Design a protein around this ligand. Structure first.
Ligand code: CLA
Ligand code: CLA
Ligand code: CLA
Ligand code: CLA
Ligand code: CLA
Ligand code: CLA
Ligand code: CLA
Ligand code: CLA
Ligand SMILES: C/C(C=C=C1C(C)(C)C[C@H](O)C[C@@]1(C)O)=C/C=C/C(C)=C/C=C/C=C(C)/C=C/C=C(/C=C/[C@@]12O[C@]1(C)C[C@@H](O)CC2(C)C)CO
Ligand SMILES: CC(/C=C/C=C(C)/C=C/[C@@]12O[C@]1(C)C[C@@H](O)CC2(C)C)=C\C=C\C=C(C)\C=C\C=C(C)\C=C\[C@@]12O[C@]1(C)C[C@@H](O)CC2(C)C
Lengths: 164, 85, 73, 166
C-alpha cells in the first residue's frame, strides 16, 4: 500500500516523506531496529559512491591504461594482484585518511553523508526541489552501479570475461 | 491467551490457531493413521530390511518422521476431546 | 545434491591404505559413514566429520525456526 | 444450505466473497485455516497452473530458438536444469516468494491487502469494482480449470508419449 516499490506491502514506520529515494522498500523491516535512518543512509550513499567509482574504473581499465607496464593488466581482478603493493597501500592510506575524520563525523551528525564535498559548487543556488532531485539521481545511479559492480565481479570470477 | 491451566485438560489455545479448530474426531483417527504409517515406514527402512547407502527412500524417512509427530497429534486429539471439540 | 542422488558423495571412500596428506590410496567421497578411525592416523575420518557437521547444520538450522518473530508463526 | 453441495450444510466461514464463493468445502478446510491464507494459496495455484498449461502446450508446438530447446516438455525439465535456465527462474521465483511471505504476513495481521493482490495491473484491464469482481471470478475459474488440465496433461504425457492430444 504505502510502498512504491512493493505496492502491496505497507512500508515500515521510519520510511516516510523526507530522505529522498524513499520508495518504501524495506520488506524485512531492517529500519525498525536502527534508531534513525542517518547512519544507514550514510552507509548506502558511501556504497553508492564507491560502486559508481568502481564501475567507472572497471570500464576505463578495460579500455584505458596508464603508460607503465605494471598497469597493463586488463582484467581488474587480475590487476588486483599484478599491481604492486605500493600503489594499493598508498590508495588504502589515502582512503583511511579520508575515513578517520569522517569516522568522527558519521556516528554523531544529523547528515553523516554530507561530507561538504562540492568543489565545483553544483549545489550553490539550487532550490530545495532541485537539491532533492539531485539526491534522488545520485541514489538511483548508485543503486544501479552497486548491482552492476557486483555483477561484473561475479561474472569475472565465474567466467573470466571482465565485461560483456 | 492464558495458556496456564489447572482443570482436567488445558484450553484449546495451547494447540495453536490451527489445531485449536480441528475436531477431535479428525485428530484422533489422523493420529492413529500417522502412527501406523510412521511405524511401518521405520520398519521398512530398517528392521525388516537392513539399511544401505543405495536404499534411503525419503518416503520412509519422511514417513518415519510421522511417528514423533503422531505423538503430538493424539495429544492434541485428547485435548480437543476433553474440551468439547 | 540438486539431483537428489546424494549417495554419489559417499561412493569410493578413502581406502585402508591411504596415506594422510598424499594421494596414495585416496578416494573421491566427501560425506560417508565409516565409523572407527583412519588406519594410518588412528583418528576419525575427515569424510565422517564433514557429514557429521552437515547433519548438525541441517538440524540446527531447522531447530532455529521454532520461536516466534515478526512473521506470525 | 450450501450452494455447491445441496446435501451438506453451507460452510461456516464462507458467506460472501467475490472470489467465487459457492459454498464448496465439504471437508471444512476453511475452519482449519484462515480463509484469507487459503484464498492466497488457491490464487497462487491458479496462476502457476495457467502459466504452466500454456507453457507446456506452446513449448511442445513451437519452442526452438536454439539447440538445447529441442525437447518435448517432458524431458525438458532435466535438459533445462542441466542448461541452467530453471536455476535462474527458480532464483527469481524464490525472491518473489520470499517477498510474498511478508505480503502474506502483512495480511493475516492487519493492513488491507486482499488475498492474491499484488497491485499488478499495468495495462488497467480492470477499471471499477464490478469489473474487478467479475474478472476475479473469471481468473479463479480459469485457474481451477488450468489446474485440472495441467494435471491431466502431465498424467497423460507420462502414461504415454505423444503430442497435444496426449
Ligand atoms: C550497501 C547496501 C545498501 C544499504 C546499506 C542500503 C540502505 C538503505 N536502503 Mg537501499 N538499496 C540498495 C543497497 C543498499 N541500501 C540496492 C543495491 C538497491 C537497489 C535494489 C536499493 C534500493 C533501495 C530502495 C528502493 C529503497 C532503499 C532504502 C534504503 C534505506 C532503508 C532500508 C534499510 O534500512 O535497509 C538497510 C539495508 C541494509 C543494512 C543492507 C543489508 C544487506 C542485505 C542482507 C542484502 C543481502 C544481499 C542481497 C539480498 C543480494 C545482493 C547480491 C546481489 C544480487 C546484488 C537504507 C538507507 C529505502 C529508503 O530510501 O529509505 C530511506 C527505499 O525505499 N534502498
Ligand atoms: C573504487 C575506485 C577505484 C579503485 C579502487 C581503483 C584501483 C585501481 N586502478 Mg583505477 N580508476 C577508477 C577508480 C578506481 N580505481 C576510475 C573511476 C577511473 C576512471 C578515471 C580509473 C582509471 C584507471 C586507469 C586508467 C588505471 C587504473 C588503475 C588502477 C590500479 C592501479 C592504481 C592506479 O594506477 O590508479 C590510477 C587511477 C586513476 C588513473 C584515476 C583514479 C580516480 C579516482 C578514483 C578519483 C579520485 C582521485 C588499481 C587496482 C591502473 C591499472 O593497473 O589498470 C588496471 C590504470 O592504468 N584506474
Ligand atoms: C584505514 C582505512 C579505513 C578506515 C579507518 C575506515 C573507516 C570506516 N569505514 Mg571504510 N573503507 C575503506 C577504508 C577504511 N574505512 C576502504 C579502503 C573502502 C573501500 C573503498 C571502504 C569502504 C567503506 C564502505 C562502503 C563503508 C565504510 C564504512 C566505514 C565506517 C565504519 C567501518 C566499520 O564498521 O569498521 C569495521 C572495522 C574494521 C576493523 C574493519 C576491518 C575489516 C577488514 C580489514 C577488511 C579487509 C568507518 C568510518 C561504512 C560507513 O561509513 O557507514 C556509514 C560503510 O558503509 N567503508
Ligand atoms: C545490473 C544488471 C546486469 C546486467 C545487464 C547483466 C548482464 C550480463 N551478465 Mg550479469 N549479473 C548481475 C547483473 C547484471 N548482469 C548481478 C547482480 C549478478 C550477481 C552478482 C550477475 C552475475 C552474473 C554471472 C555469474 C554471469 C553474468 C553474465 C552476464 C552476461 C550474460 C551479461 C553481459 C554471464 C556472462 O556472460 O559472464 C561474462 C555470467 O556468467 N552475470
Ligand atoms: C509427558 C510429556 C508431555 C506432555 C503430556 C505435554 C503436554 C503438552 N505440551 Mg509438551 N513438551 C514435552 C512433553 C510433554 N508435553 C517435551 C519433552 C517437550 C520438549 C522440551 C515439549 C515441548 C512443547 C512445546 C514447544 C509446546 C508443548 C505444548 C504442549 C501442550 C499441547 C501439546 C499438543 O497438542 O501439541 C501437538 C503438537 C503437534 C501435533 C505438532 C507435532 C509435535 C511433534 C512432537 C514434534 C516432533 C519433533 C521433535 C523434535 C521430536 C500440552 C499441555 C504446546 C503448548 O503448551 O503451547 C503453549 C507447545 O507449544 N510442548
Ligand atoms: C510439479 C513441479 C515440479 C516438480 C515435481 C519438480 C521436481 C524436481 N525438480 Mg524442479 N522446478 C520446478 C517445478 C518442479 N520441479 C519449477 C517450477 C522450477 C522453476 C521454474 C524448478 C526448478 C528446478 C531447478 C533449478 C532444479 C530442479 C530440480 C528438481 C529435481 C530435484 C528434486 C530433488 O532431488 O530434491 C533435492 C533436494 C534439495 C535440493 C533439498 C531438500 C526434482 C525431480 C533439480 C534438478 O537437478 O533436477 C534434476 C534442480 O537443480 N527444479
Ligand atoms: C509455470 C511457468 C513456466 C515454466 C516453469 C516454464 C519452464 C520452461 N519453459 Mg516455458 N513457457 C511458459 C511458462 C513456463 N515455462 C509460457 C506461459 C510460455 C508461453 C509464452 C512458454 C513458452 C516457452 C518456449 C517457447 C520455450 C519454453 C521453454 C521452457 C524450458 C526452458 C526454459 C526456457 O528457456 O524458456 C523459458 C522450461 C522447462 C523452452 C523449451 O525448452 O521448451 C521446449 C522454449 O523454447 N517455454
Ligand atoms: C484468464 C486469465 C486471467 C484473468 C482474467 C486475471 C484477472 C486478474 N488478475 Mg491475474 N494472472 C493470471 C491470469 C489472469 N488474471 C496469470 C496466469 C498470472 C500469473 C502471471 C496472473 C498474475 C496476476 C498478478 C500478480 C496480479 C493479477 C491481478 C489480477 C486482477 C487485476 C488485473 C487484471 O485485470 O488482469 C486482467 C487479465 C487479463 C484480461 C488476461 C489477459 C491476458 C491475455 C494473455 C484481475 C482479477 C492483480 C490482482 O490481484 O488484483 C486484484 C495482481 O496483482 N494477476
Ligand atoms: C537468452 C535466452 C535463451 C537463449 C538462447 C538464445 C541466445 C536466445 C538463442 C540461442 O540460439 C540459444 C540460447 C540458449 O543461447 C532466453 C531465455 C528465456 C527467458 C528469459 C524467459 C524466461 C521465462 C520465464 C518463466 C518460465 C517464468 C515463470 C513464472 C513463474 C511464476 C511463479 C509465481 O508463483 C510466483 C513465484 C508468485 C505467484 O503468486 C504467481 C506466479 C507469478 C505464477 C514460475 O512458476
Ligand atoms: C560515475 C558516476 C558519477 C560520478 C560523478 C562524480 C564523480 C561527480 C563528482 C562531483 O559531483 C560531485 C560529487 C561534487 C561536485 O561539486 C564536484 C564533482 C567532482 C563534479 C555515476 C555512475 C553510475 C554508473 C551506473 C549507473 C552504472 C550502471 C551499470 C550497468 C547497468 C552495467 C551493466 C553491465 O556491467 C554489467 C552489469 C555486466 C556487463 O557484462 C554488461 C553491462 C551492461 C556493461
Amino acid at each position: 500500500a504505502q510502498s512504491k516499490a512493493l505496492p502491496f506491502l505497507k512500508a515500515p514506520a521510519k520510511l516516510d516523506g523526507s530522505l529522498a529515494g524513499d520508495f518504501g522498500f524495506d520488506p524485512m523491516g531492517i529500519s525498525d531496529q536502527v534508531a534513525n535512518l542517518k547512519y544507514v543512509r550514510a552507509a548506502e550513499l558511501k556504497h553508492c559512491r564507491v560502486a559508481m567509482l568502481g564501475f567507472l574504473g572497471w570500464v576505463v581499465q578495460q579500455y584505458v591504461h596508464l603508460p607503465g607496464e605494471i598497469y597493463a593488466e586488463s582484467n581488474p581482478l587480475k590487476a588486483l594482484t599484478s599491481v604492486p603493493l605500493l600503489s594499493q597501500i598508498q590508495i588504502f592510506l589515502f582512503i583511511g585518511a579520508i575515513e578517520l575524520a569522517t569516522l568522527d563525523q558519521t556516528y554523531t551528525a544529523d547528515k553523516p553523508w554530507d561530507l561538504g564535498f562540492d568543489p565545483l559548487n553544483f549545489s550553490k543556488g539550487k532550490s530545495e526541489q532541485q537539491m532533492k532531485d539531485l539526491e534522488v539521481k545520485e541514489l538511483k545511479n548508485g543503486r544501479v552501479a552497486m548491482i552492476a559492480i557486483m555483477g561484473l565481479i561475479a561474472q569475472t570470477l565465474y567466467t573470466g570475461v571482465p565485461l560483456f | 491467551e492464558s495458556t496456564y491451566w489447572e482443570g482436567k485438560a488445558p484450553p484449546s489455545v495451547v494447540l495453536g490457531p490451527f489445531l485449536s479448530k480441528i475436531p477431535s474426531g479428525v485428530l484422533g483417527p489422523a493420529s492413529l493413521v500417522a502412527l501406523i504409517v510412521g511405524s511401518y515406514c521405520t520398519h521398512e527402512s530398517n528392521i525388516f530390511n537392513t539399511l544401505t547407502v543405495d536404499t534411503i527412500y525419503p518416503a520412509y524417512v519422511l514417513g518415519s518422521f510421522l511417528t514423533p509427530i503422531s505423538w503430538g497429534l493424539h495429544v492434541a486429539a485428547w485435548i480437543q476431546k476433553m474440551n468439547k471439540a | 545434491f540438486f539431483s537428489g542422488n546424494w549417495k554419489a558423495y559417499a561412493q569410493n571412500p578413502d581406502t585402508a591404505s591411504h596415506i594422510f596428506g598424499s594421494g596414495e590410496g585416496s578416494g573421491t567421497a566427501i560425506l560417508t559413514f565409516l565409523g572407527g578411525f583412519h588406519p594410518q592416523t588412528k583418528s576419525l575420518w575427515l569424510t565422517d566429520m564433514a557429514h557429521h557437521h552437515l547433519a548438525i547444520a541441517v538440524l540446527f538450522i531447522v531447530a532455529g525456526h521454532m520461536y516466534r518473530t515478526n512473521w506470525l508463526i | 444450505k450450501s450452494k455447491a453441495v445441496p446435501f451438506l450444510p453451507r460452510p461456516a466461514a464462507l458467506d460472501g466473497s467475490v472470489v467465487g464463493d459457492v459454498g464448496f468445502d465439504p471437508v471444512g478446510f476453511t475452519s482449519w485455516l484462515p480463509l484469507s491464507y487459503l484464498q492466497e494459496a488457491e490464487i497462487k495455484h491458479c496462476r502457476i497452473a495457467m502459466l504452466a498449461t500454456l507453457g507446456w502446450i506452446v513449448a511442445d508446438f513451437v519452442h526452438l530458438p536454439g539447440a538445447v530447446h529441442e525437447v518435448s516438455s517432458l524431458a525438458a525439465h532435466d535438459v533445462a536444469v542441466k542448461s541452467g535456465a530453471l536455476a535462474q527462474i527458480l532464483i527469481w521465483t524464490s525472491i518473489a516468494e520470499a517477498i510474498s511471505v511478508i505480503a502474506i504476513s502483512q495480511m493475516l495481521e492487519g493492513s488491507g491487502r486482499q488475498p492474491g493482490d499484488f497491485k499488478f495491473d499495468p495495462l488497467n484491464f480492470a477499471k471499477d469494482e464490478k469489473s474487478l469482481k467479475k474478472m476475479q471470478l473469471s481468473e479463479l475459474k480459469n485457474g481451477r480449470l488450468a489446474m485440472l488440465a495441467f494435471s491431466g496433461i502431465v498424467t497423460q504425457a507420462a502414461l504415454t508419449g505423444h503430442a497435444f492430444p496426449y
